[PDB]
JSON list of C-alpha atoms in Angstrom, two decimals:
[
{"chain": "A", "resi": 1, "resn": "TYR", "atom": "CA", "xyz": [-0.02, -0.04, 0.02]},
{"chain": "A", "resi": 2, "resn": "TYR", "atom": "CA", "xyz": [2.99, 2.33, 0.44]},
{"chain": "A", "resi": 3, "resn": "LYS", "atom": "CA", "xyz": [5.16, 1.06, -2.42]},
{"chain": "A", "resi": 4, "resn": "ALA", "atom": "CA", "xyz": [2.44, 1.65, -5.06]},
{"chain": "A", "resi": 5, "resn": "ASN", "atom": "CA", "xyz": [0.91, 4.78, -3.62]},
{"chain": "A", "resi": 6, "resn": "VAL", "atom": "CA", "xyz": [3.81, 7.29, -2.92]},
{"chain": "A", "resi": 7, "resn": "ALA", "atom": "CA", "xyz": [5.15, 9.18, -5.89]},
{"chain": "A", "resi": 8, "resn": "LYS", "atom": "CA", "xyz": [8.03, 10.53, -3.85]},
{"chain": "A", "resi": 9, "resn": "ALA", "atom": "CA", "xyz": [11.51, 9.49, -5.00]},
{"chain": "A", "resi": 10, "resn": "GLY", "atom": "CA", "xyz": [12.35, 6.35, -3.03]},
{"chain": "A", "resi": 11, "resn": "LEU", "atom": "CA", "xyz": [11.71, 7.90, 0.39]},
{"chain": "A", "resi": 12, "resn": "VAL", "atom": "CA", "xyz": [9.35, 5.01, 1.38]},
{"chain": "A", "resi": 13, "resn": "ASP", "atom": "CA", "xyz": [12.22, 2.65, 0.87]},
{"chain": "A", "resi": 14, "resn": "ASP", "atom": "CA", "xyz": [14.69, 4.35, 3.32]},
{"chain": "A", "resi": 15, "resn": "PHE", "atom": "CA", "xyz": [12.04, 4.87, 5.98]},
{"chain": "A", "resi": 16, "resn": "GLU", "atom": "CA", "xyz": [11.34, 1.18, 5.84]},
{"chain": "A", "resi": 17, "resn": "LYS", "atom": "CA", "xyz": [14.98, 0.32, 5.59]},
{"chain": "A", "resi": 18, "resn": "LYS", "atom": "CA", "xyz": [15.43, 2.45, 8.72]},
{"chain": "A", "resi": 19, "resn": "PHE", "atom": "CA", "xyz": [12.50, 0.52, 10.37]},
{"chain": "A", "resi": 20, "resn": "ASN", "atom": "CA", "xyz": [13.50, -3.13, 9.83]},
{"chain": "A", "resi": 21, "resn": "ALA", "atom": "CA", "xyz": [16.95, -2.19, 10.86]},
{"chain": "A", "resi": 22, "resn": "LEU", "atom": "CA", "xyz": [15.66, -0.31, 13.89]},
{"chain": "A", "resi": 23, "resn": "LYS", "atom": "CA", "xyz": [16.48, -1.71, 17.43]},
{"chain": "A", "resi": 24, "resn": "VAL", "atom": "CA", "xyz": [13.96, -0.58, 19.95]},
{"chain": "A", "resi": 25, "resn": "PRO", "atom": "CA", "xyz": [15.53, -0.62, 23.41]},
{"chain": "A", "resi": 26, "resn": "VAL", "atom": "CA", "xyz": [14.13, -3.46, 25.43]},
{"chain": "A", "resi": 27, "resn": "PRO", "atom": "CA", "xyz": [14.01, -2.20, 28.99]},
{"chain": "A", "resi": 28, "resn": "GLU", "atom": "CA", "xyz": [16.02, -4.21, 31.44]},
{"chain": "A", "resi": 29, "resn": "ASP", "atom": "CA", "xyz": [15.03, -5.11, 34.96]},
{"chain": "A", "resi": 30, "resn": "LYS", "atom": "CA", "xyz": [17.60, -3.43, 37.28]},
{"chain": "A", "resi": 31, "resn": "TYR", "atom": "CA", "xyz": [15.00, -3.71, 40.13]},
{"chain": "A", "resi": 32, "resn": "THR", "atom": "CA", "xyz": [13.95, -7.37, 40.71]},
{"chain": "A", "resi": 33, "resn": "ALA", "atom": "CA", "xyz": [17.35, -8.74, 41.67]},
{"chain": "A", "resi": 34, "resn": "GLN", "atom": "CA", "xyz": [17.35, -6.34, 44.68]},
{"chain": "A", "resi": 35, "resn": "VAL", "atom": "CA", "xyz": [13.93, -7.48, 45.81]},
{"chain": "A", "resi": 36, "resn": "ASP", "atom": "CA", "xyz": [14.85, -11.14, 45.52]},
{"chain": "A", "resi": 37, "resn": "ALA", "atom": "CA", "xyz": [17.72, -10.55, 47.84]},
{"chain": "A", "resi": 38, "resn": "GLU", "atom": "CA", "xyz": [15.36, -8.74, 50.21]},
{"chain": "A", "resi": 39, "resn": "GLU", "atom": "CA", "xyz": [13.18, -11.83, 49.98]},
{"chain": "A", "resi": 40, "resn": "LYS", "atom": "CA", "xyz": [16.02, -14.23, 50.81]},
{"chain": "A", "resi": 41, "resn": "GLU", "atom": "CA", "xyz": [16.85, -11.97, 53.81]},
{"chain": "A", "resi": 42, "resn": "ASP", "atom": "CA", "xyz": [13.20, -12.11, 54.91]},
{"chain": "A", "resi": 43, "resn": "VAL", "atom": "CA", "xyz": [12.91, -15.89, 54.72]},
{"chain": "A", "resi": 44, "resn": "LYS", "atom": "CA", "xyz": [16.08, -15.98, 56.87]},
{"chain": "A", "resi": 45, "resn": "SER", "atom": "CA", "xyz": [14.25, -13.77, 59.43]},
{"chain": "A", "resi": 46, "resn": "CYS", "atom": "CA", "xyz": [11.10, -15.78, 59.09]},
{"chain": "A", "resi": 47, "resn": "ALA", "atom": "CA", "xyz": [12.69, -19.31, 59.42]},
{"chain": "A", "resi": 48, "resn": "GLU", "atom": "CA", "xyz": [14.68, -18.31, 62.56]},
{"chain": "A", "resi": 49, "resn": "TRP", "atom": "CA", "xyz": [11.37, -17.14, 64.11]},
{"chain": "A", "resi": 50, "resn": "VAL", "atom": "CA", "xyz": [9.56, -20.27, 63.19]},
{"chain": "A", "resi": 51, "resn": "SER", "atom": "CA", "xyz": [12.40, -22.19, 64.98]},
{"chain": "A", "resi": 52, "resn": "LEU", "atom": "CA", "xyz": [11.86, -19.99, 68.07]},
{"chain": "A", "resi": 53, "resn": "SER", "atom": "CA", "xyz": [8.09, -20.48, 68.02]},
{"chain": "B", "resi": 1, "resn": "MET", "atom": "CA", "xyz": [-14.41, -25.07, 147.92]},
{"chain": "B", "resi": 2, "resn": "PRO", "atom": "CA", "xyz": [-11.79, -27.35, 146.26]},
{"chain": "B", "resi": 3, "resn": "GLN", "atom": "CA", "xyz": [-10.99, -24.62, 143.74]},
{"chain": "B", "resi": 4, "resn": "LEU", "atom": "CA", "xyz": [-9.38, -22.76, 146.64]},
{"chain": "B", "resi": 5, "resn": "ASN", "atom": "CA", "xyz": [-7.09, -25.79, 147.52]},
{"chain": "B", "resi": 6, "resn": "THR", "atom": "CA", "xyz": [-3.83, -24.08, 146.50]},
{"chain": "B", "resi": 7, "resn": "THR", "atom": "CA", "xyz": [-1.91, -27.34, 146.87]},
{"chain": "B", "resi": 8, "resn": "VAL", "atom": "CA", "xyz": [-2.88, -29.01, 143.59]},
{"chain": "B", "resi": 9, "resn": "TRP", "atom": "CA", "xyz": [-2.88, -25.77, 141.64]},
{"chain": "B", "resi": 10, "resn": "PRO", "atom": "CA", "xyz": [0.49, -26.61, 139.94]},
{"chain": "B", "resi": 11, "resn": "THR", "atom": "CA", "xyz": [-1.17, -29.87, 138.75]},
{"chain": "B", "resi": 12, "resn": "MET", "atom": "CA", "xyz": [-3.51, -27.76, 136.73]},
{"chain": "B", "resi": 13, "resn": "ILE", "atom": "CA", "xyz": [-1.39, -24.90, 135.61]},
{"chain": "B", "resi": 14, "resn": "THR", "atom": "CA", "xyz": [1.37, -26.95, 133.79]},
{"chain": "B", "resi": 15, "resn": "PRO", "atom": "CA", "xyz": [-0.66, -29.41, 131.58]},
{"chain": "B", "resi": 16, "resn": "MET", "atom": "CA", "xyz": [-2.88, -26.64, 130.42]},
{"chain": "B", "resi": 17, "resn": "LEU", "atom": "CA", "xyz": [0.12, -24.73, 129.31]},
{"chain": "B", "resi": 18, "resn": "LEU", "atom": "CA", "xyz": [1.29, -27.99, 127.80]},
{"chain": "B", "resi": 19, "resn": "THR", "atom": "CA", "xyz": [-2.01, -28.17, 125.95]},
{"chain": "B", "resi": 20, "resn": "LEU", "atom": "CA", "xyz": [-3.27, -24.60, 125.19]},
{"chain": "B", "resi": 21, "resn": "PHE", "atom": "CA", "xyz": [0.19, -23.28, 124.31]},
{"chain": "B", "resi": 22, "resn": "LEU", "atom": "CA", "xyz": [1.89, -26.29, 122.68]},
{"chain": "B", "resi": 23, "resn": "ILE", "atom": "CA", "xyz": [-0.24, -29.13, 121.51]},
{"chain": "B", "resi": 24, "resn": "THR", "atom": "CA", "xyz": [-3.41, -27.53, 120.33]},
{"chain": "B", "resi": 25, "resn": "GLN", "atom": "CA", "xyz": [-1.49, -24.76, 118.63]},
{"chain": "B", "resi": 26, "resn": "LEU", "atom": "CA", "xyz": [0.58, -27.42, 116.98]},
{"chain": "B", "resi": 27, "resn": "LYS", "atom": "CA", "xyz": [-2.54, -28.88, 115.51]},
{"chain": "B", "resi": 28, "resn": "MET", "atom": "CA", "xyz": [-3.83, -25.59, 114.07]},
{"chain": "B", "resi": 29, "resn": "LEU", "atom": "CA", "xyz": [-0.59, -25.02, 112.26]},
{"chain": "B", "resi": 30, "resn": "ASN", "atom": "CA", "xyz": [-1.34, -28.32, 110.61]},
{"chain": "B", "resi": 31, "resn": "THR", "atom": "CA", "xyz": [-4.74, -26.86, 109.50]},
{"chain": "B", "resi": 32, "resn": "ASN", "atom": "CA", "xyz": [-3.70, -24.71, 106.52]},
{"chain": "B", "resi": 33, "resn": "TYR", "atom": "CA", "xyz": [-5.95, -22.98, 104.03]},
{"chain": "B", "resi": 34, "resn": "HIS", "atom": "CA", "xyz": [-4.55, -22.93, 100.42]},
{"chain": "B", "resi": 35, "resn": "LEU", "atom": "CA", "xyz": [-5.37, -20.11, 98.05]},
{"chain": "B", "resi": 36, "resn": "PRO", "atom": "CA", "xyz": [-8.05, -21.42, 95.64]},
{"chain": "B", "resi": 37, "resn": "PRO", "atom": "CA", "xyz": [-6.75, -22.13, 91.99]},
{"chain": "B", "resi": 38, "resn": "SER", "atom": "CA", "xyz": [-7.91, -19.80, 89.25]},
{"chain": "B", "resi": 39, "resn": "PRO", "atom": "CA", "xyz": [-4.80, -19.69, 87.07]},
{"chain": "B", "resi": 40, "resn": "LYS", "atom": "CA", "xyz": [-6.05, -17.12, 84.38]},
{"chain": "B", "resi": 41, "resn": "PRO", "atom": "CA", "xyz": [-6.27, -18.61, 80.82]},
{"chain": "B", "resi": 42, "resn": "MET", "atom": "CA", "xyz": [-4.75, -15.34, 79.65]},
{"chain": "B", "resi": 43, "resn": "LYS", "atom": "CA", "xyz": [-0.99, -15.38, 80.00]},
{"chain": "B", "resi": 44, "resn": "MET", "atom": "CA", "xyz": [0.85, -14.99, 76.69]},
{"chain": "B", "resi": 45, "resn": "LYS", "atom": "CA", "xyz": [4.14, -12.91, 76.50]},
{"chain": "B", "resi": 46, "resn": "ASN", "atom": "CA", "xyz": [3.75, -12.67, 72.70]},
{"chain": "B", "resi": 47, "resn": "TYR", "atom": "CA", "xyz": [4.94, -10.17, 70.06]},
{"chain": "B", "resi": 48, "resn": "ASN", "atom": "CA", "xyz": [4.01, -9.28, 66.61]},
{"chain": "B", "resi": 49, "resn": "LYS", "atom": "CA", "xyz": [5.57, -11.33, 63.79]},
{"chain": "B", "resi": 50, "resn": "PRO", "atom": "CA", "xyz": [9.12, -10.17, 62.87]},
{"chain": "B", "resi": 51, "resn": "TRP", "atom": "CA", "xyz": [8.03, -6.70, 61.30]}
]
């Protein structure tokens, strides 16, 4: 629909060449590792209390 | 009045003292009254979970 309906000189090609070769930044976590470590620390405090109880 | 016969008075004075002041008292000490048992069903030194 955009190859056969734009009379501009090859501009549709380089937009689409820029698109298929575009790398959208996948967001990385940076925040779950530190709550897992807090979780580990908690189960430690939990388990020692279950031992006391 | 034989009550006024002051010769046998020491025969009454001593065993009374041996009965009113030693023996009977020694039986009341052996009649103790314990405090009745109502241990309360509410005795829990507890604390919130670790947070």
